[PDB]
Design a binder for these strands. Structure first.
Ligand SMILES: [Mg+2]
Ligand SMILES: [Mg+2]
Ligand SMILES: [Mg+2]
Ligand SMILES: [Mg+2]
Ligand SMILES: [Mg+2]
Ligand SMILES: [Mg+2]
Ligand SMILES: [Mg+2]
Ligand SMILES: [Mg+2]
Ligand SMILES: [Mg+2]
Ligand SMILES: [Mg+2]
Ligand SMILES: [Mg+2]
Ligand SMILES: [Mg+2]
Ligand SMILES: [Mg+2]
Ligand SMILES: [Mg+2]
Ligand SMILES: [Mg+2]
Ligand SMILES: [Mg+2]
Ligand SMILES: [Mg+2]
Ligand SMILES: [Mg+2]
Ligand SMILES: [Mg+2]
Ligand SMILES: [Mg+2]
Ligand SMILES: [Mg+2]
Ligand SMILES: [Mg+2]
Ligand SMILES: [Mg+2]
Ligand SMILES: [Mg+2]
Ligand SMILES: [Mg+2]
Ligand SMILES: [Mg+2]
Ligand SMILES: [Mg+2]
Ligand SMILES: [Mg+2]
Ligand SMILES: [Mg+2]
Ligand SMILES: [Mg+2]
Ligand SMILES: [Mg+2]
Ligand SMILES: [Mg+2]
Ligand SMILES: [Mg+2]
Ligand SMILES: [Mg+2]
Ligand SMILES: [Mg+2]
Ligand SMILES: [Mg+2]
Ligand SMILES: [Mg+2]
Ligand SMILES: [Zn+2]
Lengths: 58, 70
RNA sequence: CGGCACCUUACGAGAAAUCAAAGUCUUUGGGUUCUGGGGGGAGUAUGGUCGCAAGGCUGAAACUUAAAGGAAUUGACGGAAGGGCACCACCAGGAGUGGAGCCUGCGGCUUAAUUUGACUCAACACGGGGAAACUCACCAGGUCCAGACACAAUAAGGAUUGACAGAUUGAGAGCUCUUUCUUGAUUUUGUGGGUGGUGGUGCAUGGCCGUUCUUAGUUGGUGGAGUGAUUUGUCUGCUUAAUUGCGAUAACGAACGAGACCUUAACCUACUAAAUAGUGCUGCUAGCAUUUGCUGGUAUAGUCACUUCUUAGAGGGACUAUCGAUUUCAAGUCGAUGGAAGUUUGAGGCAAUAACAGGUCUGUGAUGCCCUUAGACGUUCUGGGCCGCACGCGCGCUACACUGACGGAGCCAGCGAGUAUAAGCCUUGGCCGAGAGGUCUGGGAAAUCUUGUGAAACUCCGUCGUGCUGGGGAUAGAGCAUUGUAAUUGUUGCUCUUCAACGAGGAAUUCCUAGUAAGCGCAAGUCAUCAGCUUGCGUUGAUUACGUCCCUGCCCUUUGUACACACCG
C-alpha cells in the first residue's frame, strides 16, 4: 500500500484528499510476492499407472 | 480582550530640517576672485574636501564622520 | 346432529398485523339494516325533544390546517427481561491513595497582570507547559516598519535617512526636544491594495490525535423469506483472548477486522567471521609457598590459536509434540513426560464498517471568515507575572522506625548520549579544596575514551535501645561555590546551626496474576542551570486466584416506543 495526502485550497476552507492504492502483490519485485496467509497448494501429481515389477535397463 | 488606553501624549517623529540652498553659506565668492572654503571642511581621511563642519556653539561637527573639535 | 373454542396450511384474502373468515371481491351482483368521506373547530353553538338533576338523543357553521393517521422495517433509547466479557469489574490477596510535611497541577481568592485550553471515564506531573531574560500569548512603559505594488501629491534651488554635544529617558533609543551637519530620489503624505497576527470562531475547516474499541465487530455474490423497507447467511448449545472454532442449520461458499504479519526477549559448544569482544597458550615479567604450584601486570607484532562466552547474518527450533483423563468423542480443556521455550512462548507495533459538534486554528509559509493593522492585537527593548495565599481537590515524593537509623567494610547491572575556531559535548588522570568546586594535560565524532558508567537497595562488623530517640527532615539564620548579561521573590550545589507535623491514617477509592506487584537505583527528553516528571533500563523479588457475574462498564438477544436533531428526544 502506498498513500498520498494533499490539502486542497478552496474558497470556503480546506479540502483534504487521501488516495490509498493497494498494488498487486504478484507484481512486487523487492518484497514478498503474496500475502502472509495466502497458501498455494500444489496440484495432485498422482493418478499414474503402476506396472507390476519390471526392470528398465538404461 | 482589553482596550489599550494611553497616558502619555502622542509623540511626533522628528522631521528633517530643510535649509534653502545650504551650499551658499559654505562659500564666499570674490568678484574677480576664487573659492573661500570658509566652513573649515573636515580633515578626516574618510571625508575629504566639500564635507564641512557645523559652526555651532563650542564645537564643530561634520555629519559624514561623527567627530567634534574644541 | 348442535354449541364454546383451538391447532396446521394458505387454495384464497389483505397495506400489513393477520384472517376458515376478514375466503368464494376489476373473472366486480344471494337478501337486507345501520354507519364513514383529510385533520381540527366539535359531539362544540343553536333549535327541538326526553330527564327531578346530572345529563341523553338529534346536531351545524364561521374559521383554521398539509397533513393527521394505519401496519410493518432498521436504528436509538428504557428507572424491562435474559445471556456474555473484562483486575481501566468483582472474588482471594498484595501494594497502596484518602490521615502528616513537601513537590506539582486544577479551582478559588488576590492581582497591574497573576496569559490560556481542558472538567467523569476520555479535564487536574496534560498541551512533551521542569516559565529568572528569550520562550510570552499577561501587565507598566520605550523603539522600528521589516506598509510590497500602480497611482496622485512633494521633490534636486534637494523627497528623505543617519547623527556628535546638552536637555529628556529606565536606557551610550538622534525616541523626542535645542543643534546645524551629513546622505541623495532607494525614498516623505493621501488613495487603493497589502502584509503580519500565541487576536476570535475546533459550534466554519484540513491534517493529526483521542474515543466508541483494541472490545469483536462489519460486508457483499448466489440461493431462501417478504409487495416492500429489509431479513437469513451473521445461530439454540459447547468452546475460545477473539463472529474462533466445533456443532446445529434455508443456506452455500467467501472478504475486511481477529488471527496470521512485523519488531523485540528467551535456545543453538550447529554454520560465518572478528587487534573496536573475550579466552587459552606463548614471550617478558612481578609477589607468596618453594612442588613443577597460585594470583597478577605487560605484548595494535608472540606479525600465536580459538569462537565457550561477546557482537550480528543466514538458518534451525514449537506445531500444544507424546501419553493419560474428560467432551456431542468434535472444537477444546485439565494433568503429566520430554523440552530453552507448553499462560496466544513473554512484550509490543500495525489494526475493520461507519461516526463524535471529543481536543487542538497556542505546531505549522495548513486554512475560510470576523477583528486589528502605525499611539498596532505586527516586531523589538527594559522591568514585573505566569510561583502571587483565609481555602477544596488530584498526579506524586519523603516518613512515621530495631525486617530500622547512623559508621566503617564488601561490591554487583542494563537501556543510552557525547565536539572544532566552536560560542563549546562526554570527560578519565595528576594537583589543590572538609565539601561543593577549581586548575593543568590527554582520550573519544565513539563496541576503542568518558565507562566494568565499581548505581541504589543489598551483605558483614560496630554504635544506638523503644525515647517524637541517633526515626523524620519541613521551617529558618549565617557562610562558601557553580550556571548565566542578570540568581532579589533564596536556580542549583556544599558547610554549620534551627529539629515542625507525622507514632501506620475515617467515609471512600486506585493499580495489579510472574521475573508480575512491590521496593531500589541508573540513562535519555526537556536542559546555560534546575527532575519530587515522563520515556526506557536493569538490581532484589513475593502474597493470592487461575474463578464468577455479586457491584461497575460495555457487547449481544428478546421486548416496548407517540423517539429518528434519535431521552441532552
Ligand atoms: Mg396476496
Ligand atoms: Mg388461524
Ligand atoms: Mg376467528
Ligand atoms: Mg372531516
Ligand atoms: Mg405505529
Ligand atoms: Mg461477547
Ligand atoms: Mg478486594
Ligand atoms: Mg507511600
Ligand atoms: Mg483563576
Ligand atoms: Mg493562576
Ligand atoms: Mg505553570
Ligand atoms: Mg513569540
Ligand atoms: Mg518581554
Ligand atoms: Mg505590553
Ligand atoms: Mg470537534
Ligand atoms: Mg436475495
Ligand atoms: Mg423476491
Ligand atoms: Mg446476531
Ligand atoms: Mg443481519
Ligand atoms: Mg453462536
Ligand atoms: Mg558462539
Ligand atoms: Mg520439563
Ligand atoms: Mg501477541
Ligand atoms: Mg466543543
Ligand atoms: Mg497522568
Ligand atoms: Mg548501611
Ligand atoms: Mg580535551
Ligand atoms: Mg555494562
Ligand atoms: Mg535522621
Ligand atoms: Mg528528634
Ligand atoms: Mg525554573
Ligand atoms: Mg536530565
Ligand atoms: Mg513535565
Ligand atoms: Mg478471567
Ligand atoms: Mg452484571
Ligand atoms: Mg423495535
Ligand atoms: Mg419524527
Ligand atoms: Zn567628516
Amino acid at each position: 500500500i502506498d498513500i498520498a495526502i494533499r490539502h486542497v485550497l478552496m474558497r470556503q476552507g480546506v479540502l483534504g484528499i487521501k488516495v490509498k492504492i493497494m498494488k498487486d502483490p504478484a507484481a512486487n519485485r523487492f518484497g514478498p510476492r503474496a500475502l502472509p496467509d495466502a497458501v498455494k497448494i500444489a496440484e495432485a501429481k498422482d493418478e499414474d499407472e503402476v506396472i507390476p515389477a519390471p526392470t528398465v535397463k538404461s | 480582550r482589553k482596550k489599550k488606553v494611553y497616558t502619555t501624549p502622542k509623540k511626533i517623529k522628528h522631521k528633517h530640517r530643510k535649509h534653502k540652498l545650504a551650499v551658499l553659506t559654505y562659500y564666499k565668492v570674490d568678484n574677480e576672485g576664487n573659492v573661500e572654503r570658509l566652513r573649515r571642511e573636515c580633515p578626516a581621511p574618510t571625508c575629504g574636501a566639500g564635507i564641512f563642519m557645523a559652526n555651532m556653539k563650542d564645537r564643530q561637527y561634520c555629519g559624514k564622520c561623527h567627530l567634534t573639535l574644541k
